[model samples]
Target: MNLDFLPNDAFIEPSGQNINEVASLIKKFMDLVIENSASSEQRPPLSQIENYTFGEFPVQGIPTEGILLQLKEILRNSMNPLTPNYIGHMDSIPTLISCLGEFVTTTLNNNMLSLEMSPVFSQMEVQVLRKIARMFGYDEQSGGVMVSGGSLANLQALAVARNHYFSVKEDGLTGLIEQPVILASEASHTSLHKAAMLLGLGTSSVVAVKTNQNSQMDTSDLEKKINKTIEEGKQPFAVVATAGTTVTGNIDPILSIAEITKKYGLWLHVDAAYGGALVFSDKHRERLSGIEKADSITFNPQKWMYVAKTCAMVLFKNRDLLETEFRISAPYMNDTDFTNLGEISVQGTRHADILKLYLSLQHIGLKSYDQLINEGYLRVEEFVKQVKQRPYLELASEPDTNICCFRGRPKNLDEKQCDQWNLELQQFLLHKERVFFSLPTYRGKRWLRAVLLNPFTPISTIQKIFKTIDEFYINHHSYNS
Candidate 1:
């Protein structure tokens, strides 16, 4: 009924009176969140998070002071990824530039739907993605658009690939002679399965190729699968090579995979959601050497680049297909001189996420990520060494990135009990030392996973983790006996 909450309402209120008060209050709230994050020694326990709620929406507008209080409570119960003790997941500390960029983006309130609604930001998206495409070894002809997250990015890439091969955009998959399928390594992300369903292909249409002991996609097995698909009277439209696998972070043999895709005349899509950060590293960029050959790629800078949440992108080797093949011009919007990115994008109303990625890359400096990523690799090498030293532990695979997934196999514990033992051990470390390790199931068995994304995840922490494992073994050996 009233516009007191709206100052020119920049979240711009027409009145502009409450603008300073609103801005200052929001800053105060952010400062509190940061304070809680930096100083917190331990994350909230599972029970607290499992049943937590922020209460129901109120009919009345709460004052800024009251809202901040509720937010602080929420912050207290939240998991702190900024802490070096936090290493449970692939999440990393977001850069300050991105956080600041987010504020500026929301203030301007740009919709990425069209150039008219978001002129500068829309154009900004094009050039920003061009720079990133080049980093992935794509030439000038390469271009892409950003998605909200990796799953959507995967969906977007597959949609484009599907249209390119079958012209399914014009008419559904009804024209296809044989059942269309996509082939990916067994170790690849689960998003591929979801992408298949969204593209009108059944979930089973995503054929799983085998992985060797090292967890790298077996190119021999890959070729065998492709031939088998053809023999079964099915056509493989795309072959997905994971730049970094979800569970073990092992990179599939991209160079070999590319050769196979080319031989079969199938689209090559590389899901580099977690491993794409390697492009900044001079030392480890060779891990993704053949990525340039990919017809499309799904890269999530949020995972390893330390950019803020929800910054995912999908790139293409040939930029022209984006507008000509996949685009369906919005009927209501008039044609403009500038490109409307949303026309090619899968999502209609997109956020100005381009600002956050652009600012983070600029402020964090591309060269700085080289050091950040290379250091993570060094930490991972140390972690793997630590895993191998202990007789009770087993490495899942030789890690290709900073992620190391290993499980414990104590002498007394059987394979079945080992799963529960490892999970209990994971909880023990979290409770005992405030060190978090995620329990990710690799090969259908639970494994404790550590990702060395944080620079502050010290050598001492790794040593201490091993020491705790020894302590756990000692206590268990005596108690169980």
Candidate 2:
């Protein structure tokens, strides 16, 4: 009866469960599910389950009663993404096509590092990457891959840039007159810095370019920085431009940035992980005007494109750059003329993650994606208007996309008071189950950020969220003021 001690290959039957136990299990599961239905939707504090449950392991036979009960509770009572209030990150309501695709992929359990291991999924990944590349005006000669997400995609993009600058493969950083530097906006994702660290380029080499009030990168600063770097005798290898920044969802001026990068002959990589999906949107695609011209560009279909996670694409304006940057001819990986992902990727063994995206695109179609993205823009704009109408709240910045930042403005509250108020009020909203949002600090001030991901999440829900915050602020602020 101790399932933990048994191997999964063994058998268990009514030799195990009687009608009574089945009924008990059903009732317990149903009760747990119903109880979850009413609970406030927020990520459970990690402490709640940090030491409470067993992690994954294979069992030869059925689990013991304790393990079964634990499994039931874990499944039924975990953070329910189904709730209307769950709007923390770029999470999505699961799509049927992607889910089914995932099911098929899991059943096969293939590693997609090489085409031989998984011909179908690997080829499918290439196909999807090709489509994304073409969207950015890249042709068959352009090379890319589906990475884990923006972080890995950006990391790889930088790695390619790094290798290309010095032919690091043939001639290492040795004998080079200067260490390579990467230029990116101040609002670039933290992952870019992390990539610099991991790639043996000091994080300090990743210079922070300035952005205007709209959070678009100031191109003038970029030119100045590049010129200064060149005067100082530092090798400027790459420039990272943001299609959409994380904080405000505002895009950097890609076209202008591209001009500077090209003028300086630096590798231009566009991090459009958030705003790149805007390519499907009629209103926002223009925001990424020069994205197609970048030497490299990265984006996630999962974010604004309404697909599930693990589907992000990195494209190259020049395919040979990827091959030259990540080229390796290991016999096990590459005997045929076909592309081995390891040849162009830093990852050794990657998941067959592209199937879900390919399946979703096939089922949903481009028009459907366009409509969904357009609707998301409407939601962001509509919510901004609502926030403007309310006196107690203010827009942190205009909604560049679905991300809207605001703060609870109680008449004359000082900055510190507003900070503390928002800090506690956000937590309070999570606990109350009224709605969910995140807090991001800007200019040393705290602001509540709502990243709308769910297509069905009504603008009315966002209004209700603000109203609830107002009521909570009134109740809590009175005591302190």
Candidate 3:
């Protein structure tokens, strides 16, 4: 292959026939891979690839047939998320529409910073944000932006909240009138602390409020803490409420917390990245009551709604607050006399991340989405029912959503040996084939956590998973001393 060419002429082909050939070749390659990716009974252990070594490849070179085969074999050994066994993370499988939209967005190469460069994409982002805000019970007055994921969304919400309190635009959080603090449950995601740290507020500034056994924030403790902060001459600026804690899918008492935040003049920000999809569910909507009263809400369609990655939204009830936080005008950037998307966002160069959400919504309307999400809730309920029926297993907590946490039990073991046996049994099952789950500790006890984020997963698949856990229990019951 030739190495050098002018920048403008590098990708310019002399004949159009070559372009067709390249496209055809890629299509054939992808089709072959997709067709051959069938679920196997003897698949490799899904949890074993911690830090496996990956072979190096040249940056620019032609590979022999053997090298191609090796690459295919290595890829084949990876976890097949499309299989029913995959239910580990939030992303179980990719949707065809979202994947197709991703390919189109990559080919378009539009930076959604301004309407001029990406007119339709910028508009699409705004439309999707508005739709998401509406689902959260906000009217047209609310404003938001599509971000990379929940992390960025949380950071943006905090940035807006910080500005809402001390005017980060003017004072930069250094010499505020009082010591600013944020109140959140101890079970809240670590992203809250990360956001505080990034905004110049130390992690110590996040006051840890107590949570009940149901994982809801203790509103009494929250009120006491806010009053205590006031008495101690510290300023309680914002309250970060967890809609669904990542580990256990527990929802905080949003309405109770909102009442306190409102009385104390605190900015309420909800971290609903995992549980935000419940807005689509009529029965689950009550769990997120008073979210509309929040100054900001962060959620990800990619998590529970089953959209592709990098599709999260951070919405603000007050639109001007977002513009006031990150708004900056430049001569070259604002020539179009249109609303610059960057003015309301912390990001300068943004991708067309909203297209997938819009397409998914259009494909499956509100009713269909609600059914899918509600079905997920029912699936978790069924899993809990099954957990209670099994004599050798115990439910860890009253599950709030699609996450079930439990520990396997040995039939005839004492307390000391049963604890150790349960811990080892979880690891042993991961090494065994046909099931995927994560282990999370609650109250210092190790628990096997099964999160149901896959819409395609049916009751049969869950039954198979429970069977695997039962088999692991049967094989390990003798190990208990």
Candidate 4:
């Protein structure tokens, strides 16, 4: 077979001759990313990107230079969340070591489904998740598996809960005599409701327990709802307590919720995807008190620890329970090996993503992570203080973590007008100032939400935000008058 027509350059496999070329291409791309991330003034968090389609597949492959050109164009239009002014979402700018680990992991292309496929990474996953589980107050028997993100983690947690409580593993939902329902705070992440739907319990089965003014779950309401569920002939098997809620970042009273779940024999799964980083902070870890009582937890390092994206963990209280309750045998693969990760996880063909977290921990250590976490919390306090001083701005809730929600209201405007003004202010800033903040609705009122995840985000940025809002309000008030 004559293979001369298939040139070496056509394939991605790097050789001695082309290795330097590959290095150079990667270096150039990384340098561009670093430049864009240096400051918000250099680039906007996001921009209106012109739509383009991948044209029909070329019969002949494009040259490396052409590919690099296209890559540059895509990068130009991409959102730069690493910018300090970007407090719009839970997105994080990964640490340097994590990025290097990601590069190595992608090059190796190891699959995490089986130990034979990813021997070192498979062991690393177990060890790293064990360490994380301990941080959440689990014993030596605690362990977990990494998933693509927090949503999947939440789904898997519920699946495990259902199997453990209702024996739904082999028999499925059909084995259950009563309709299963999950109880969660009204401010909980939407993923819980989605999980209920996917687990054969329809969305209607997810009961939204009332929340207090701070957005924490109302414990009394929770017990009332649980009793009602039982009296109505439905079973309440799980309670999802949020450590850091999506809108306000308020942590539910985990200790209180745990007591309630214990009394009712319900599975407590803590959705600590956003607030789990507090574990590293000695000063603030108390916010997650009673997290140890949870049977499982969903945590995302990608959100707070600055690991790369698509790295989240679903932790279990007992390591053996996952294998016992969730494992599925595969005859074609290494069936003899109990360590085959796919048997216990919802996903197969998993990436060796654990390397990023492992490398990050080794490179920066927990002390540095503690400092970063503290810095973010302190910045949130500063932001809240500034918001309080402004007569036209009122905080939606006293921030429990780094997420701050507030609204812009002029004294002259009514409640309805204030809501409209805040919405308009958000759009105006995004288009004109390129300062991005998330708008979240709470109890039918819209508020601007700023997630202080970036430790480098300046206090001046918070001041500038209010200044911009004040200027906009003045313009609107004058125009109306």
* TM-scores vs. true structure, each candidate: 0.93, 0.86, 0.90, 0.94
Candidate 3 Cα lDDT to native: 0.77
CA lDDT scores, all candidates in order:
0.83, 0.75, 0.77, 0.83
Cα deviation of 468, candidate 2, in Å: 2.9
TM-score of 2: 0.86
Q: What's the distance in Å from true for residue 157, model 4?
A: 1.3
Please give the ranking of all candidate structures by TM-score, highest first, separated by commas.
4, 1, 3, 2
Error of 3 at 245 (Å): 0.8
The list of candidate 3 runs beyond 4 A from truth reads: 1-15, 36-60, 63-71, 409-416, 431-433, 467-481
lDDT of 1 by residue, 108-127 (tens): 87798778888788878888
For candidate 2, lDDT tens digit of each residue in 1-481? 5565534323333355445655565577556645654552443421135335356675543544565566656765455555556666666566678867886788577997777888777777777788778877777788787777789888888888777777777667667778788888888889988999988888798888887777778888988888898888687888888766787888777788778777878888888887878777666577768777788888787777656667887888888877766777554634777788766776768877788877888898878888888887788788888778667787766767778888876777788878888888888887765466778898688888877777768877777776776678667745465
Model 4 Cα displacement at 123 (Å)?
0.9
Ranked by TM-score, the better of candidates 2 and 3 is: 3
lDDT for 19 in candidate 3 is: 75
Better of 1 and 2 by TM-score: 1
- After superposition on all CA atoms, what RMSD does each candidate show versus the true structure? 2.4, 4.9, 3.2, 2.2
Number of clashing residue pairs, candidate 3: 0
